[PDB]
Amino acid sequence: LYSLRPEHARERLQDDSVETVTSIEQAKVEEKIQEVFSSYKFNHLVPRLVLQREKHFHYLKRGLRQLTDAYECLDASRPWLCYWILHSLELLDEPIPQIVATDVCQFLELCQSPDGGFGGGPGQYPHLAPTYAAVNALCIIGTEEAYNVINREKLLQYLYSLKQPDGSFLMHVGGEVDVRSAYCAASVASLTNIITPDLFEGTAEWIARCQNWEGGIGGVPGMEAHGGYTFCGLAALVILKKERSLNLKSLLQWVTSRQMRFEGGFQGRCNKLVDGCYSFWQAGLLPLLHRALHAQGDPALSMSHWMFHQQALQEYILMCCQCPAGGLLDKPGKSRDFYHTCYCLSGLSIAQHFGSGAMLHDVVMGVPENVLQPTHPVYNIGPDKVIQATTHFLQKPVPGF
């Protein structure tokens, strides 16, 4: 294993003897991770990386039905719980009962607002985050019924209701503004085919203003480059077919710098710690950046791998981010939840599968049963569901008015 090797131990943190609150914390994670790595040596077994797929399936399978009061804090993010669960199952190649999928469809219908879009639960004001989630969920199911839950004529109204003169959108009426709104709108509008000519007017320009001196993208122009926001920005530009509105060179140097030499996983911000959810928000940026670069006819691009260590990220996840009882997590010690479950898995899948036209170099770490179904680097739903959804809505006219 790349990680359990003896030279990898040199990838340990160079403190410079000038220790700050950052060194300290980083060094702390590194030791807890080292332990995991050396887990094998101390116990005298041969290392066998395996994805506790059944344990994870039983966890997800239960949460799709009910959660403890510990989830009272995500009471306004219910379509998200559907999406995270219904996507992890989707990657674990697990089943979505023709009855449960309906209930999900029926429930989301209750979350949907008469003004268009979706709320966090029955009766909540529509918000772009839950909307993005609901739509992705409905597509993962992908049936006349699910698709039909989505009110496209109302969704445009809503999208337009949030639109800002400078090109940005609000997350909800009277709500905040940051890149998530741009990606959320772009993702749902494109999939459901409601993109008019002036819907995203000036949006690519605003998103490009979010790109700062680091090569990365921030929440709003002027802010620090952040992985979750950089994914929102890049992916939003890919949808709008305007990746080029950015300096892809520096964006590339930035994202690639985010992978932790010693841990293998990614960090959300320079000088922060590793975190399993970023296995997707950050690593997902390379497939996006492959297309982009090859699109401008780049020769130096690989035909088998992504511009990040696919191996190391799979080790990190498999070894460090798996919960025995099921579910994945931030890093060792951290508690399990469906968000990290949905994103560690999404990142594993990114790491296991490459593409480049007709090239297909998958890399599966450990037990080959560890390979996951594929996920689309823009929507983060199975590339088949994406294709299936767009085309189905494509036979509907854009709500012209």
């Binding site: 160079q14 403190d15 804090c73 429930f107 004001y125 700062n212 001196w213 293998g264 690989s302 260590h309």
Partner: protein
Amino acid sequence: FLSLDSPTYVLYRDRAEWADIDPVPQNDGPSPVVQIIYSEKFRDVYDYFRAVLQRDERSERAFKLTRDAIELNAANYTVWHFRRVLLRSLQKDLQEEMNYITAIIEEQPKNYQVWHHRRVLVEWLKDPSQELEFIADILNQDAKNYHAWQHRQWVIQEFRLWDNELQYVDQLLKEDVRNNSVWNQRHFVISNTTGYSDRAVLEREVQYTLEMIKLVPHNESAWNYLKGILQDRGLSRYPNLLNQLLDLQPSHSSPYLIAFLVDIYEDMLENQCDNKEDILNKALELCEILAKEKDTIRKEYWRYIGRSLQSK
């Protein structure tokens, strides 16, 4: 009026001043999914919120209830909305509300609604007078709260409060020179006040940054900053650069020195230079060292820079 934590807290259903209303329960449909098992307390406050809201009862009792609904789930943006409506309607003392949101943010400094709510109040009041001090207190508990820095940049931008922020940045950079949020803030500030075109400023900056590098050579932020402030004019338009950095090869080396050099070389090539052939050799060798020995986590990127360095 009555704490959710008070030992003598009573359910709304058990309340005398809340008997004229009928608690509207959540409708998750005959066959629930991702259904939360709320506590009798959580369910009680919200069944009552659904009702007051549903009635659009814009009352003082409704006001006091959003408070409890917010404490049970501060991330509930719908409740936060209705509360702002009540703030306008009931014509509430906003400064008093500034205090409320101040305490709530201290409790949940990573919640999206609380920061936004605060920003709305400040806008309503057109008063940024408490902001930098409040933010600094939050940044004192977590020097990298993204929301805190973002809110901060808004207060400075909007109210044009730039004068003492660079002094602040310097303070925090003294506390943790690896604080990327501060390096970013320093850029935000300078680039919006004087800019980096001013030779004296540019020099002062590069100097200071070469210092922090030749102090904590493996601290990446200083490197990305120095690169950031110069790369926007051409590293190659700075002859002395390659030298001083080359001087740090054995005294302050990290794969950052090597990566920076690979970046200079790239630009001395874009701009065409004598010895370019050797330059390209040196640069590709560095790409292989970083790729094979010096920084293998990104061997896919480093060899790709080797290959691009071929064509261009």
